[PDB]
């Protein structure tokens, strides 16, 4: 399940730090340098975080137009997926 | 120009102020998981632009006012701000660049940018596809009359045709009266009335009775002439508007249907044409035949086509129709939901080959094969603790293909 993959990557990054930047999560999930990340990979991850947020597992903050997306953990992140 | 953003306020699933941002993107897809509010995007767009297809229920409810504003940058490019508000009693307020106006003045501002509510040349609902794929030939004629402007002459056309019909039989009736009067004159003169009046005021009765029959006929003649000329003028204008639209769509449909049915296996695509069903001197009184055959198919009836093939033929017709009066932007409902992967790819290719200055695309997309090819994305998610929909953006032009 795609959401399961993303759920695991976020629990790792958000277990130490309170927030992680989407583009950092995307480099981790793509297993490559950011210069090589493809539109298909970026869209898959973007949709995955929207799913996790609608399920109540993460929080999303973006304060600038096309700006960095900040992700924080919710309690349900460590109980679902 | 183009839309650079929509701003919402307490609209349906959105609590407070939110932004649907497009920026300088000419191909934006709006996406999100089910029950996130994505479906409310169509609603907000068609609301702020004035589509009628309950008004109190659009306001957010926790379970009080709401508005939607379209921000549009013309070719100059100056800013246009089109705001529609739902007030506390359920009525609509209209504002243009932050000044109150009435509904008519609102539409006119939109028409000036070729955003035509009468033709809905800027938006394809999902229901439009079903409606197109099941419509009768006479329904298609009426649709072309609607988008072409010729339908606004229909009632005047039919009123004046009736006047011609009446004034015609009135002329024939008064002509037969005059033929009987002049026939009674020949009989009354062979009566040798000169002798009778020499050894009579009735001779003056025939004087004014014949003078009356003449004046009455000449009036029926001039009235029929006026009705015939009024009717022919309206008929000519109705035909002019209709033929201009029909000619455009008939020419385009062949090309658009190919583009949407070309594949690696069948690089020639299918074949489509439009035609007036029956022979007539007044095309808008006949039905319009739309025939489309995918590659390597050829039967007379289209109802033997698959649901996918019917959908793609309907989309081709909708594109061909809306190209007659090109909108600066174009909003496409979530049609990729029901389509197989091959057809989703063809929609994607068609959009990328047209999305740019002069035709901005805003697409509701369920299928990654489509929305992963956008210039930018609008993601809609549900904040359950706050009980509201929210939006995120991602510029996909930063990332590479392959």
Summarize the topology.
The complex is a heterodimer of chains A (81) and B (402).
Chain A: H1 2-16, E1 19-21, H2 22-30, H3 39-54, E2 58-61, E3 70-73
Antiparallel strand pairs in A: 1-3, 2-3
Helix pairs in contact in A: 1-3, 2-3
Chain B: E1 2-9, E2 17-21, E3 27-31, H1 40-49, E4 66-73, E5 79-86, E6 92-96, E7 99-101, H2 103-111, E8 123-124, H3 126-134, H4 137-148, H5 154-190, H6 193-196, H7 202-259, E9 271-276, E10 288-293, H8 307-322, E11 329-332, H9 341-352, E12 360-364, H10 368-371, E13 376-383, E14 388-395
Parallel strand pairs in B: 3-12, 3-13, 8-11, 11-12
Antiparallel strand pairs in B: 1-2, 1-4, 4-5, 5-6, 6-7, 9-10, 13-14
Overview of the structural elements:
Helices cover 49% and strands 14% of the residues of chain A. Chain A has 81 residues and is α+β, with helices and mostly antiparallel strands. Chain A has a three-stranded antiparallel sheet. In chain A, helix 1 (2-16) crosses helix 3 (39-54) and helix 2 packs across helix 3 (39-54). Chain B is of the alpha/beta class and 402 residues long. In chain B, the strands form three sheets. Chain B has a six-stranded antiparallel sheet with strand order 2-1-4-5-6-7, with helices on one face. A six-stranded mixed sheet of chain B has the order 8-11-12-3-13-14. The chains are: A alpha+beta (81), B alpha/beta (402). Chain A binds chain B through residues 36-44, 46-47, 50-51, 53-54, 56, 60, 62, 65-66, 69, and chain B through 21, 23, 31-33, 35-36, 368, 371-373, 376-377, 379-385, 390, 392-396, 399-402. The PDB classes it as cell cycle.
């Amino acid at each position: 399940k795609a959401i399961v993959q993303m759920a695991k990557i976020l629990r790792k990054e958000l277990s130490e730090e309170k927030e992680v930047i989407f583009t950092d999560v995307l480099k981790s999930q793509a297993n490559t340098e950011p210069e090589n990340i493809t539109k298909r990979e970026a869209s898959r991850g973007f949709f995955d975080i929207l799913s996790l947020a609608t399920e109540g597992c993460i929080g999303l903050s973006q304060t600038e137009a096309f700006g960095n997306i900040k992700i924080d953990a919710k309690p349900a992140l460590f109980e679902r997926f | 120009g183009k839309l650079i953003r929509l701003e919402l306020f307490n609209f349906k699933s959105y609590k407070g102020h939110h932004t649907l941002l497009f920026g300088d993107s000419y191909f934006t897809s709006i996406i999100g998981p089910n029950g996130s509010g994505k479906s409310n995007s169509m609603d907000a767009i068609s609301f702020v632009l004035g589509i009628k297809s309950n008004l109190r229920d659009l306001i957010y409810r926790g379970r009080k006012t709401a508005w939607v504003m379209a921000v549009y940058e013309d070719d100059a490019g100056e800013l246009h701000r089109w705001k529609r508000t739902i007030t506390a009693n359920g009525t609509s307020e209209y504002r243009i660049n932050d000044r109150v106006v009435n509904a008519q003045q609102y539409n006119e501002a939109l028409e000036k940018e070729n955003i035509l509510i009468k033709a809905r040349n800027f938006l394809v609902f999902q229901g439009d596809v079903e409606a197109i794929a099941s419509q009768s030939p006479q329904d298609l004629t009426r649709l072309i009359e609607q988008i072409s402007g010729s339908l606004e002459y229909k009632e005047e056309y039919e009123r004046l045709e009736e006047e011609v019909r009446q004034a015609t039989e009135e002329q024939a009736y008064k002509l037969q009266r005059r033929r009987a009067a002049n026939s009674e004159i020949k009989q009354y003169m062979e009566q040798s009335p000169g002798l009778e009046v020499l050894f009579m005021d009735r001779l003056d009765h025939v004087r004014k009775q014949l003078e009356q029959t003449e004046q009455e006929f000449e009036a029926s003649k001039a009235k029929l002439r006026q009705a015939r000329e009024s009717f022919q003028a309206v008929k000519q204008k109705r035909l002019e508007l209709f033929n201009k639209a029909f000619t455009h769509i008939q020419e385009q449909i062949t090309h658009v249907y190919k583009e949407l049915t070309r594949s690696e296996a069948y690089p020639l695509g299918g074949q489509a044409y439009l035609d007036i069903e029956e022979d007539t001197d007044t095309p808008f009184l006949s039905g319009v035949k739309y025939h489309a055959m995918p590659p390597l198919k050829r039967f007379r009836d289209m109802e033997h086509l698959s649901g996918g093939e019917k959908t793609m033929a309907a989309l081709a017709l909708l594109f061909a129709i809306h190209s007659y009066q090109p909108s600066p932007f174009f909003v496409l409902d979530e049609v990729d939901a029901a389509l197989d992967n091959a057809n989703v790819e063809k929609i994607k290719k068609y959009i990328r080959e047209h999305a740019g200055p002069g035709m901005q695309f805003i697409v509701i997309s369920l299928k990654p094969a489509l929305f992963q090819a956008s210039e930018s994305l609008i993601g809609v998610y549900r904040d359950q603790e706050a009980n509201t929909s929210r939006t995120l953006t991602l510029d996909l032009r930063k990332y590479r293909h392959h």
